[PDB]
Design a binder for this molecule. Structure first.
Ligand SMILES: CC(=O)N[C@H]1[C@@H](O[C@H]2[C@H](O)[C@@H](O)[C@H](O[C@H]3[C@H](O)[C@@H](NS(=O)(=O)O)[C@@H](O[C@H]4[C@H](O)[C@@H](OS(=O)(=O)O)[C@H](O[C@H]5[C@H](O)[C@@H](NS(=O)(=O)O)[C@@H](O[C@H]6[C@H](O)[C@@H](OS(=O)(=O)O)[C@H](O[C@H]7[C@H](O)[C@@H](NS(=O)(=O)O)[C@@H](O[C@H]8[C@H](O)[C@@H](O)[C@H](Oc9ccc([N+](=O)[O-])cc9)O[C@@H]8C(=O)O)O[C@@H]7COS(=O)(=O)O)O[C@H]6C(=O)O)O[C@@H]5COS(=O)(=O)O)O[C@H]4C(=O)O)O[C@@H]3COS(=O)(=O)O)O[C@@H]2C(=O)O)O[C@H](COS(=O)(=O)O)[C@@H](O)[C@@H]1O
Ligand SMILES: Nc1ncnc2c1ncn2[C@@H]1O[C@H](COP(=O)(O)O)[C@@H](OP(=O)(O)O)[C@H]1O
Ligand code: NA
Length: 266
C-alpha cells in the first residue's frame, strides 16, 4: 500500500576523514550528517588499515546508499598514521578527497591517554610514558601518543600519493569555538552548498561543548556522548612545557606544509 522509493546505489566514499585520533573526527562527521547531500557510515570501518583483505566489494557494501549528488563518507582516525593507506586509498580512487581534523599535539596526546584510562584505570602515568627512561630528559617519540602528533611526518606519506589540494586540514580547536565557521570551509572543500550554519548549533553549558539543535536522526537536541569531551587528568606542568618544546619545530613545519598556522605555538 505504501510507495517504496529508490534509495540509490552504494558508492565508494568520495571523501574520507582520515585522521587524527582525538582531533574531533566524530564531531565533524556528525555535523556533516545534517547536510541533505551527505550520507555517512556510523562506526569506524578500519578498512584501509585492518580489514583491507576483505576487499573493496565488502567496503562498498558497508556504505550507505545515496541518491545522485549526495556524497558518501566515513571516518577512521588511524588511516593518517597507516603507512600503506595512502597507496591503497589512491588505488581505490586517485580523486578521493581527504580530511584531517588536527589538534594541538599536546592536548591530543593527553586526550588519547585519557581515552585509554577510561577503559583501563591502572595504566602507567602519562609522565612516565612521555620519556625514554620513564622519568626525564629524552622524549619517547616511539610512544604512540606522541608519534601520532607529529603530523608533518605522516603528511609526507600522503603527499607521495595525493596533491595537497585534495586534502583539508580542519582546526579541531576552531571546530569547538566556531563550528559553523569551520563547517563552512569543509562544505566548500566538499563542493557542498553551505547549509550547515550557526543556527544548527548551540552551546550546552553542562556538556561544555557545542551541540546540535537537531541531528540527522533526531528532532531533538543532540550532544556527543560520554566518550567525547572527557575530563583530562592534570599533567605535570613541567612535562607539558617539555612536550610543547618538543613539538614546536614539527608544528612549524606542518604550518609550512599546509599553509596555515593552527595557533598551537603562539
Ligand atoms: C543522533 C543521530 O542522528 N543518530 C542516528 C545515527 O546514529 C549514528 C551516529 O550518527 C554516529 O555518531 C554513531 O557513532 C558511534 C559509533 O558507531 C560508535 N562505535 S562503536 O564501535 O563503539 O559502537 C562509537 O564510536 C566511538 C567510541 O565510543 C569510541 O570508543 S572509546 O571507548 O574507545 O572511546 C571509539 O574510539 C575508537 C578510536 O577512535 C580508534 N582510534 S584509531 O586511531 O585507532 O582509529 C581506536 O582506538 C583504539 C585502537 O583500536 C587501539 O589499537 S589496538 O591495535 O591496540 O587495538 C589503540 O590502542 C593503543 C592505546 O590507545 C595506547 N594507550 S595510550 O595511553 O598510549 O594512548 C596504548 O595502549 C597500551 C597501554 O598504554 C599500556 O599501558 C597497556 O599495557 C598493558 C596492557 C595489557 C597487559 N596485559 O594484558 O597484561 C599488560 C600491559 O597496553 C596497551 C595496549 O597495547 O593495548 O597502545 C595501544 C596500541 O597502540 S598502537 O599504536 O601501538 O597500536 O587505541 C585505542 C584507543 O581507544 O585509544 O578504537 C577506538 C575504540 O576501541 S575499542 O576497543 O573501545 O572498541 O570510536 C568512537 C568513534 O567516534 O568512532 O560512538 C559513536 C557515537 O559517538 S557520539 O559521541 O557521536 O555519540 O553511530 C550511530 C549509529 O550508527 O548507530 O544513525 C543511526 C543509523 O541510521 S542510519 O540511517 O545510518 O542507518 C540512527 O539510528 C541514529 O538515531
Ligand atoms: N561538539 C563536541 N562535543 C564533544 N567533543 C567534541 C566536540 N567538538 C570537538 N570535540 C572533541 O572531539 C574529541 C574526540 O575526537 P575523536 O572523535 O576524533 O576521537 C574530544 O576529545 P576530548 O575527549 O579530549 O575532549 C573533543 O575535544
Ligand atoms: Na589511547
Amino acid at each position: 500500500l505504501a510507495l517504496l522509493l529508490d534509495e540509490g546505489s552504494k558508492q565508494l566514499p568520495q571523501a574520507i576523514i582520515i585522521g587524527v585520533k582525538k582531533g574531533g573526527t566524530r564531531a565533524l562527521l556528525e555535523f556533516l550528517r545534517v547536510h541533505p547531500d551527505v550520507r555517512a557510515v556510523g562506526a569506524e570501518p578500519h578498512f584501509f588499515d585492518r580489514s583491507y583483505d576483505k576487499g573493496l566489494a565488502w567496503y562498498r557494501d558497508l556504505m550507505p546508499r545515496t541518491l545522485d549528488g549526495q556524497i558518501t563518507m566515513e571516518k577512521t582516525p588511524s588511516y593518517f598514521v597507516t603507512r600503506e593507506a595512502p597507496a591503497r586509498i589512491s588505488a581505490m580512487s586517485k580523486d578521493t578527497k581527504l580530511i584531517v581534523v588536527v589538534r594541538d599535539p599536546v592536548t591530543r596526546a593527553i586526550s588519547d591517554y585519557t581515552q585509554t584510562l577510561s577503559k583501563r584505570p591502572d595504566i602507567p602515568t602519562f609522565e612516565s610514558l612521555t620519556f625514554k627512561n620513564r622519568t626525564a630528559g629524552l622524549i619517547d617519540t616511539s610512544w604512540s601518543a606522541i608519534q601520532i602528533g607529529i603530523y608533518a611526518k605522516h603528511l609526507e606519506h600522503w603527499l607521495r600519493h595525493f596533491p595537497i589540494r585534495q586534502m583539508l586540514f580542519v582546526s579541531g580547536e576552531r571546530l569547538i569555538s566556531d563550528p559553523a565557521g569551520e563547517l563552512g570551509r569543509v562544505q566548500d572543500f566538499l563542493g557542498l552548498k553551505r547549509i550547515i550554519t550557526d543556527k544548527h548549533f548551540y552551546f550546552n553549558k553542562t556538556k561544555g561543548f557545542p551541540c546540535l539543535k537537531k541531528a540527522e536522526g533526531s528532532s531533538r537536541p543532540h550532544c556527543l556522548g560520554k566518550t567525547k569531551g572527557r575530563t583530562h587528568p592534570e599533567i605535570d606542568r613541567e612535562v607539558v612545557r617539555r612536550l610543547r618544546e618538543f613539538y614546536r619545530p614539527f608544528n612549524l613545519k606542518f604550518y609550512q606544509m599546509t599553509g596555515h598556522d593552527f595557533g598551537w605555538d603562539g
